[PDB]
């Protein structure tokens, strides 16, 4: 039960995008960097496009994907609407129609409070079906497919691995063989769902794995469960 976790992840993904970290797609006189997985999580069109491998309002649509905020004006509304229609982004389509229903002469900044949760939920659906995963994490015998960007968002250890010049481009990451696979699996689920499935027999392994992955708030939550 971590109710701010999806909002935290979204802000981390936005920080990444601003710094170009793990960004694997670039749109053009403006250069916009993005993550394919995040785009796929927000747009059915991008998801199809990236599985299979320039428009004026794209900046605004990207901004919305990464911040949950959409800034409309009379100057950009039609552009944003056209792009959103093409990308099948219903939330945006409806916001544009809502703005135009006012006529126009209004700007609007709209904040979609459920968007972060929707993104994380969709990233997890992508992970379930192995879509756009770009890394395999190997823990002793077991193998876990994931998106680097999500790992980096949730774990200091993964941040350091993915920004190391000798490891950043590896598609397979072998963790220390002392690491408990079950512990890792539980933490990986936590990253993608906000739910930490602690059981009495796993708490010590999860706690240790969280310490190694540098997830301090999870370590604290494990500690509390031992004391309750």
From Swiss-Prot:
Disease: Chromosomal aberrations involving BCL6 are a cause of B-cell non-Hodgkin lymphomas (B-cell NHL), including diffuse large B-cell lymphoma and follicular lymphoma. Approximately 40% of diffuse large B-cell lymphomas and 5 to 10% of follicular lymphomas are associated with chromosomal translocations that deregulate expression of BCL6 by juxtaposing heterologous promoters to the BCL6 coding domain. Translocation t(3;14)(q27;q32). Translocation t(3;22)(q27;q11) with immunoglobulin gene regions. Translocation t(3;7)(q27;p12) with IKZF1 gene 5'non-coding region.
Name by which UniProt lists this protein: B-cell lymphoma 6 protein
Subcellular location: Nucleus
Comment on protein domains: The BTB domain mediates homodimerization. Its dimer interface mediates peptide binding such as to corepressors BCOR and NCOR2. Interaction with corepressors through the BTB domain is needed to facilitate the rapid proliferation and survival of GC B-cells but is not involved in the T(FH) formation and BCL6-mediated suppression of T(H)2 and T(H)17 differentiationrequired for GC formation.
UniProt-reported outcome of changing residue 217 to A: Abolishes interaction with NCOR2 and HDAC2, no effect on interaction with CTBP1 and transcriptional autoinhibition
Subunit structure: Homodimer. Interacts (via BTB domain) with the corepressors BCOR, NCOR1 and SMRT/NCOR2; the interactions are direct. Forms preferably ternary complexes with BCOR and SMRT/NCOR2 on target gene promoters but, on enhancer elements, interacts with SMRT/NCOR2 and HDAC3 to repress proximal gene expression. Interacts with histone deacetylases HDAC2, HDAC5 and HDAC9 (via the catalytic domain). Interacts with ZBTB7 and BCL6B. Interacts with SCF(FBXO11) complex; the interaction is independent of phosphorylation and promotes ubiquitination.
Part of the intact protein present: 5 to 127 of 706
Domain of life: Eukaryota
Ranges annotated as spanning the membrane: none
Listed result of changing residue 122 to K: Abolishes interaction with NCOR2 and HDAC2, no effect on interaction with CTBP1 and transcriptional autoinhibition
Domain BTB: 133-200
Tissue expression remark: Expressed in germinal center T- and B-cells and in primary immature dendritic cells.
Post-translational modification: Phosphorylated by ATM in response to genotoxic stress. Phosphorylation induces its degradation by ubiquitin/proteasome pathway. Polyubiquitinated. Polyubiquitinated by SCF(FBXO11), leading to its degradation by the proteasome. Ubiquitinated by the SCF(FBXL17) complex, leading to its degradation by the proteasome: ubiquitination by the SCF(FBXL17) complex takes place when aberrant BTB domain dimers are formed.
Conditions for induction: Down-regulated during maturation of dendritic cells by selective stimuli such as bacterial lipopolysaccharides (LPS), CD40LG and zymosan. Protein levels decreases upon genotoxic stress in a dose- and time-dependent way.
Gene it is expressed from: BCL6
Protein role: Transcriptional repressor mainly required for germinal center (GC) formation and antibody affinity maturation which has different mechanisms of action specific to the lineage and biological functions. Forms complexes with different corepressors and histone deacetylases to repress the transcriptional expression of different subsets of target genes. Represses its target genes by binding directly to the DNA sequence 5'-TTCCTAGAA-3' (BCL6-binding site) or indirectly by repressing the transcriptional activity of transcription factors.
